[PDB]
Amino acid sequence: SPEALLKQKLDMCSKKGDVLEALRLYDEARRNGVQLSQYHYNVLLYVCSLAEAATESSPNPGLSRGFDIFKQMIVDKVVPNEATFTNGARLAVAKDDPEMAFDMVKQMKAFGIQPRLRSYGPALFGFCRKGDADKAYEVDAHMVESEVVPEEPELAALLKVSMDTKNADKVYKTLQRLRDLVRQVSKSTFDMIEEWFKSEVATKTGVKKWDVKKIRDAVVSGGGGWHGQGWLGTGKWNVKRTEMDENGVCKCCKEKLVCIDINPVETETFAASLTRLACEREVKANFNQFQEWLERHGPFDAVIDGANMGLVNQRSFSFFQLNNTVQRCQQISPSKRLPLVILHKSRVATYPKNRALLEKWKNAGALYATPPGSNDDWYWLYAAVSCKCLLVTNDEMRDHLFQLLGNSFFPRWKEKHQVRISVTREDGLKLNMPPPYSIVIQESEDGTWHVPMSVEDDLQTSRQWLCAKRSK
Ligand SMILES: *C1=CC(=O)c2cccc(O)c2C1=O
Ligand SMILES: [Cl-]
Ligand SMILES: [Cl-]
Ligand SMILES: [Mn+2]
Ligand SMILES: [Zn+2]
């Protein structure tokens, strides 16, 4: 078959990086009357993206024809899959021309195609590299219109280009988007925010007088921890790297950070999504059987990830560590409820009194053994969300399938619900409880900023904050 042969030969072109041959096969296909499909185009886009951008000549046919191929693919009305967007972006990156990259996203839009975050990257990051804030903000407006939500790298580039063009309003807006969407910032973003607050433009942007009641109302309206009404105060910012004490009090300025509530409606929506996700990945009847069991049990004050409590910092499963955690959770329960222990059925062992205790927990309504083949993470997570209670795990809950849970609601929920264990020689096992404040960029009523750095494990490493406070 002619289409199957083209596929065969383009696959070989891809495997060898033979761009001049792929372009001859593409043309030969036009001359032969062979219709290209989604798959054919996706190989061509990949193959074309391997061509270099020409510094010492007019651009090479590889990238030049690649953009013509992308334009023809869209004109044919072939449906893009995830490899189309990825390969389209690789081409844009190779060309290193943000205007042409932005033209690709404009083309998609004009033919009713929803662009992906990675399609915008080459455009946004290209314009930001050139210091062209105006085009960067056009690309940003285009994303907002298309409902593609930026991540930290896009916001960081927007912040940097705003700083470069001395645009204090855009710096302010971008910092609010970082607060809203990212909460805690990477090292590179943290350093960039510090540079902003110490800069001349920051020193010279401000207001001496403002309506304290308009600030008050925006604080109530926003959910807490910010107001969004603009830079306040005047003069130089005193900018220090610092820490919060266990109560959320800044060690530099003594401001008490606030605790931001989670709207119960968001929690309901999240619980429904979690249930849907769990049923897609588990055997539906297994997960449903747990849901039915959970409805008949409780109440619970805590849910334990049994595997994690047994295994964290251990060379093999420690019944001691599991059992010590159960006991300690029961002790902090106001009515001494056993925590709900979630374990794999293969665990539920070798010492008779330990097996007897596991069976006693089960008989007390405080243990569920997840079935053969299951991923027990869905079970303890659904349990803690549904019971609105503490979740005891040292799992960071960020990688692999935890990415399916998103980066807005879930990190906020974790912060309020996750209990982690730590062990010392002097004291043994400790429960580390949720903080009494929210670890998020905060803007106070008087215009003081506290910016938290993102870290892997905030019990291992002491989290650095920026305190930016006007010196007058
Ligand atoms: C925010 C404030 C607070 O006082 C508190 C107390 C106990 C448990 C919490 O999660 C919180 C909180 O998130
Ligand atoms: Cl209660
Ligand atoms: Cl005993
Ligand atoms: Mn697990
Ligand atoms: Zn402070």
Swiss-Prot record:
Q: Which residues bind Mn(2+) 2?
A: 377, 395
User: When this gene is knocked out, what is seen?
Assistant: Embryo lethality when homozygous.
Q: Which GO terms describe its biological process?
A: tRNA 5'-leader removal; tRNA processing
GO cellular component, alphabetical, reads: chloroplast; mitochondrion
One annotated GO molecular function: metal ion binding
Domain PRORP: residue ranges: 244-467
Subcellular localization, as worded in the UniProt entry: Mitochondrion; Plastid, Chloroplast
The cofactor required is: Mg(2+); Mn(2+)
Residues bound to Zn(2+) are 250, 253, 450, 467
> What coarse category fits the chief subcellular location reported for this protein?
mitochondrion
Keyword ATP-binding in annotation: no
Mapped PPR repeat ranges? 2-36, 42-80, 81-115, 116-150
What remark does the entry make about the cofactor? Binds 2 Mg(2+) or Mg(2+) ions per subunit.
Family statement drawn from the similarity comment of this UniProt entry: Belongs to the PPR family. P subfamily.
What is the role of the protein in this entry? Endonuclease RNase P responsible for the 5' maturation of tRNA precursors. Preferentially cleaves at the unusual cleavage site, but also able to cleave at the classical cleavage site. Also involved in the maturation of mRNAs in mitochondria.
In Swiss-Prot or TrEMBL terms, this protein is called Proteinaceous RNase P 1, chloroplastic/mitochondrial
This chain's source organism reads Arabidopsis thaliana (Mouse-ear cress)
**Where is the organism placed in the taxonomic lineage, from the top?**
Eukaryota, Viridiplantae, Streptophyta, Embryophyta, Tracheophyta
Q: Which gene encodes it?
A: PRORP1
Q: Which residues of the full protein are shown?
A: 95 to 570 of 572
